[PDB]
Amino acid sequence: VQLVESGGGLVQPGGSLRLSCAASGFNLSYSDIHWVRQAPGKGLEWVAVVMPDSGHTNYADSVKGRFTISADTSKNTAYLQMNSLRAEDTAVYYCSRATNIPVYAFDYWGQGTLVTVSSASTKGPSVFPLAPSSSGGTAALGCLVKDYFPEPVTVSWNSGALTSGVHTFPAVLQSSGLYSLSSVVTVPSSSLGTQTYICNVNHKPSNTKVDKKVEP
Amino acid sequence: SHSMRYFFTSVSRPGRGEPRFIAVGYVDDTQFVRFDSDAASQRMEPRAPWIEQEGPEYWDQETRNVKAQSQTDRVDLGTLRGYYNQSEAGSHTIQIMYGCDVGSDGRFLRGYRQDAYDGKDYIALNEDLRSWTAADMAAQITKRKWEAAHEAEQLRAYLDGTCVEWLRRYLENGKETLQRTDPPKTHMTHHPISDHEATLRCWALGFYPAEITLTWQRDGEDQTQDTELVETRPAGDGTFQKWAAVVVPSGEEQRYTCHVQHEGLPKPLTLRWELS
Amino acid sequence: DIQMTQSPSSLSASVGDRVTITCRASQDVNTAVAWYQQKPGKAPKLLIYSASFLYSGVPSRFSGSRSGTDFTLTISSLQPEDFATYYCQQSYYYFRPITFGQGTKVEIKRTVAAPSVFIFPPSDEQLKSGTASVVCLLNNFYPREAKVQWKVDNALQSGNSQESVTEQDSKDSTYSLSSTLTLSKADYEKHKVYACEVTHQGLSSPVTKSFNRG
Amino acid sequence: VVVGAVGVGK
Amino acid sequence: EAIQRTPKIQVYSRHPAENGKSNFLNCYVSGFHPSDIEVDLLKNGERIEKVEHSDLSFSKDWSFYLLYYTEFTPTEKDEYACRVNHVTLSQPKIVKWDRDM
Incomplete structure (x- = not known):
C-alpha cells in the first residue's frame, strides 16, 4: 500500500479551470487521496478529503463554492477544479496518495501549483549581466534576466561549456508585475583572465531566449 | 484444544x-x-x-x-x-x-x-x-x-x-486456572401451572466452558418443539449456567428425562424427575 | 481551540549534531502527533509519524517520542544531509491532517560566517531595466539578519524595495545572496556612489565597502 | 498478546 | 443502519437464591445490538446506584452481552426488578426478578 503521485506543474489558471492528480500501484479505493494544500510556510486541507470511496469527500472541508468534489476511485483518484483566477490562486496543492493505514508510510506527493501572484501572460524577458568592479577574494560576474514567469530557468555560460559557478535564482513579484531572476557566476582570477565570458539564458515560460556577451 | x-x-x-x-x-x-x-x-x-x-x-x-x-x-x-x-x-x-x-x-x-x-x-x-x-x-x-x-x-x-x-x-x-473443566451440577424441578398441566425445568450450574447441550428426552425422542431454553448465562464469577423447560401434563412427567453433555462430563447424565 | 505550536530548534547539524524539536497543542492527545519533513524548495516527505509507535521513512535514524501529557511532542534529528523545515501535524482524534504546525528549521553547521559584501555597480543595462537594482552581493553568511544597505538612492530602501531571495547554498551551509531592487531608472543615474553597510549578528559594526568604477 | 504491529486500516 | 436486536433480559442470582443471604443480582442483558443499554437495578422501583458491570463483550453473531450486577439480600418484601431500557424498548421494561424462574 505504498505508492506514487502525479499531476503536472500547472500554468496560469487566469481563466477558472481544473487540476488533477492520479495514483498508481495498489488501488486504495477506500481511504486515499486527500489534497492537502499549502502556501509558502503553512498547510491546509481543502476539498477532496477522502475522495475515492468512503464518501463525504469533504471531511473537514470548511470551504465551498469553488473548490469542487470531482473524482473517485477510478485508479486515478481525483481531478480537482478551481473556479478561481484571482483570489487565493497561489497554493501548491498536494495529494496524500498512500493514505492506507494509521501507521505506514504516507507517500504523499511531489507537485501541485498555482498561477503566480501576478497574472495575465507575463511579458518577454530582459537580460542584464553584471560586470565586476574589481575581484578581491571571490570574483563574480553577474547575469540577471527580468520580466517573465516565476518558473525556473536553464543558464549557459562559457558558451554553454561551463555551467559551474552559476547562481540559480528564484523570482519574486516586483513593481513590474513580471517575475525576474538572475545568474551570477563566480570565476577564479586565473580562469577569469584566460577565458572570455558568455551568458545564455533559457526560460521556457518566457518563450524568448537570449545570449549575452561580456568582454574584459 | x-x-x-x-x-x-x-x-x-x-x-x-x-x-x-x-x-x-x-x-x-x-x-x-x-x-x-x-x-x-x-x-x-x-x-x-x-x-x-x-x-x-x-x-x-x-x-x-x-x-x-x-x-x-x-x-x-x-x-x-x-x-x-x-x-x-x-x-x-x-x-x-x-x-x-x-x-x-x-x-x-x-x-x-x-x-x-x-x-x-x-x-x-x-x-x-x-x-x-x-x-x-x-x-x-x-x-x-x-x-x-x-x-x-x-x-x-x-x-x-x-x-x-x-x-x-x-x-x-x-495452568492452574485454564486447564480445568467444571462438571455441571444438575438440578431440576417443576412449576405446576394448574391441576392439569405443568412445566419442568432442568438446570446447568457451574460449568466453565461455554459449550453444553440440554435435551429433554420425551419417552425416546427429544420434544424439540416444546423446548423453551435460555441462552448461556454468565454467572458473574467465571462460571456459566443455562436452563431449558417444557410443558407437561400431570403424571406424564415420568416420560421425560434431561440429558446433558459437557466436556467436564465423561458420561452424559440422565435427569429423572423425582415425583416428589 | 486546536493550536499546534512549534517550540523549535535549529542551527547545528554539522555531521552528527543531535537536535530536539518539540511541538505544543491546545488540545489533549493520547500518545501521538504526526511529523513531516519538507525539504528546502521541493518534495514534502513523511518522516517519523507518531508516538508510542513511531514509524519512519528511509531516513530511519531519528526518534519521535511520546509526551503523554501535552507538554510538547518531540523529535530527534542528527545528521546534516537531512536539512528540512519540520512540521507537527495532528493525531489523537483522527483528523486526516487538518491543523499543521507552523515550522522549525534544521541546517548543517559549517562556519557561522559573517557576510561578505563586495560592491558591484550594475552595468549600463541596469538603466535599460527602467528600475534600479544595485546589487549588494552577499556571500557565505548565515541566514540573513545582516542589515545590508541599499544605497541605490544613498538612502535606506526598506519596504518600498523588493528582494529576490537566495537559499542556503548546501556546499557552504550559507546563502550567496544577490540584491534585486525595482526602484527606477532615474534613481540609478542620479546617485553614482554605492556602498553596502553590514550590521549583523555576526557583524555588529555597519561594515561598509566602496566599489571602484570599471 | 495483541497484534504487535500497527495493522492495516479496515 | 442496524438491526436493533432487542435485549433478552434475564434477572437471576448467580447462586441459588436463599432467604436473607449475600447473592448478586445479575441482569444479564443478552444479545441486543445497538450497544447503548440503560440497565437499572430497581430496589422496589427506585434505581440503585452502587452497581457495576462486566465489560462490553459481543457474540459470534455480533450481539452484545453485559452483566450488570450488584450485591443484595433476598427479603420477602422487596421486588427486585431490572429497568432495562433501549432504543428498541419504547417503555422502560420492568423485567422482574422471578426467583422461581
Whole structure:
C-alpha cells in the first residue's frame, strides 16, 4: 500500500479551470487521496478529503463554492477544479496518495501549483549581466534576466561549456508585475583572465531566449 | 484444544464525547485483560491473576499495542461509516475478533480474524489463512486492500508464531486456572401451572466452558418443539449456567428425562424427575 | 481551540549534531502527533509519524517520542544531509491532517560566517531595466539578519524595495545572496556612489565597502 | 498478546 | 443502519437464591445490538446506584452481552426488578426478578 503521485506543474489558471492528480500501484479505493494544500510556510486541507470511496469527500472541508468534489476511485483518484483566477490562486496543492493505514508510510506527493501572484501572460524577458568592479577574494560576474514567469530557468555560460559557478535564482513579484531572476557566476582570477565570458539564458515560460556577451 | 480471542468493540458515541472503546481479550472462555477508554487509567488493567506476573515491560507494550488498536478503530469508524454512507452524528459500532487455536499438544490448528460493522458481517479470514471472504460490497474494498499489502501474510505470521507461542505461555502461566473443566451440577424441578398441566425445568450450574447441550428426552425422542431454553448465562464469577423447560401434563412427567453433555462430563447424565 | 505550536530548534547539524524539536497543542492527545519533513524548495516527505509507535521513512535514524501529557511532542534529528523545515501535524482524534504546525528549521553547521559584501555597480543595462537594482552581493553568511544597505538612492530602501531571495547554498551551509531592487531608472543615474553597510549578528559594526568604477 | 504491529486500516 | 436486536433480559442470582443471604443480582442483558443499554437495578422501583458491570463483550453473531450486577439480600418484601431500557424498548421494561424462574 505504498505508492506514487502525479499531476503536472500547472500554468496560469487566469481563466477558472481544473487540476488533477492520479495514483498508481495498489488501488486504495477506500481511504486515499486527500489534497492537502499549502502556501509558502503553512498547510491546509481543502476539498477532496477522502475522495475515492468512503464518501463525504469533504471531511473537514470548511470551504465551498469553488473548490469542487470531482473524482473517485477510478485508479486515478481525483481531478480537482478551481473556479478561481484571482483570489487565493497561489497554493501548491498536494495529494496524500498512500493514505492506507494509521501507521505506514504516507507517500504523499511531489507537485501541485498555482498561477503566480501576478497574472495575465507575463511579458518577454530582459537580460542584464553584471560586470565586476574589481575581484578581491571571490570574483563574480553577474547575469540577471527580468520580466517573465516565476518558473525556473536553464543558464549557459562559457558558451554553454561551463555551467559551474552559476547562481540559480528564484523570482519574486516586483513593481513590474513580471517575475525576474538572475545568474551570477563566480570565476577564479586565473580562469577569469584566460577565458572570455558568455551568458545564455533559457526560460521556457518566457518563450524568448537570449545570449549575452561580456568582454574584459 | 485452546484458543485466544481479542474482541475489540468501538462505539462511535458522537457529539457527547470520544468513541468509547472496550477491548476485551479472552482465553478459552475466561477474560484476562480489559481496556475502557473511560475508566481509572488508560492501561490494560489485568483481569485475571495469572497475568499479574508479567511485569512492567509487558503491561507497557500491551498498552501501547491496544491503544494502537483503539487508534485503528477510531480511524476506520470514519471509513466504514463513510462507504456505508451513514449520516455523520449517529451511533454506529465496529467489532473485531482475532484468534489462533492449538492442539491439546500445543500445535497450531486454525486462525480466524472476523470483522463486523453495525451488527452484521464484514471481511473474515479463511481456514487456510490465505484469503478473505468479503461479505458485502464494502468488505470487497477491504479484502482488496488486505490481499494487497499482504496483511494476510503478516497476520498469519502473527497467528502461528506469536499468537501460538504466547498462547502456550499463557496456558503455562494459567495452568492452574485454564486447564480445568467444571462438571455441571444438575438440578431440576417443576412449576405446576394448574391441576392439569405443568412445566419442568432442568438446570446447568457451574460449568466453565461455554459449550453444553440440554435435551429433554420425551419417552425416546427429544420434544424439540416444546423446548423453551435460555441462552448461556454468565454467572458473574467465571462460571456459566443455562436452563431449558417444557410443558407437561400431570403424571406424564415420568416420560421425560434431561440429558446433558459437557466436556467436564465423561458420561452424559440422565435427569429423572423425582415425583416428589 | 486546536493550536499546534512549534517550540523549535535549529542551527547545528554539522555531521552528527543531535537536535530536539518539540511541538505544543491546545488540545489533549493520547500518545501521538504526526511529523513531516519538507525539504528546502521541493518534495514534502513523511518522516517519523507518531508516538508510542513511531514509524519512519528511509531516513530511519531519528526518534519521535511520546509526551503523554501535552507538554510538547518531540523529535530527534542528527545528521546534516537531512536539512528540512519540520512540521507537527495532528493525531489523537483522527483528523486526516487538518491543523499543521507552523515550522522549525534544521541546517548543517559549517562556519557561522559573517557576510561578505563586495560592491558591484550594475552595468549600463541596469538603466535599460527602467528600475534600479544595485546589487549588494552577499556571500557565505548565515541566514540573513545582516542589515545590508541599499544605497541605490544613498538612502535606506526598506519596504518600498523588493528582494529576490537566495537559499542556503548546501556546499557552504550559507546563502550567496544577490540584491534585486525595482526602484527606477532615474534613481540609478542620479546617485553614482554605492556602498553596502553590514550590521549583523555576526557583524555588529555597519561594515561598509566602496566599489571602484570599471 | 495483541497484534504487535500497527495493522492495516479496515 | 442496524438491526436493533432487542435485549433478552434475564434477572437471576448467580447462586441459588436463599432467604436473607449475600447473592448478586445479575441482569444479564443478552444479545441486543445497538450497544447503548440503560440497565437499572430497581430496589422496589427506585434505581440503585452502587452497581457495576462486566465489560462490553459481543457474540459470534455480533450481539452484545453485559452483566450488570450488584450485591443484595433476598427479603420477602422487596421486588427486585431490572429497568432495562433501549432504543428498541419504547417503555422502560420492568423485567422482574422471578426467583422461581
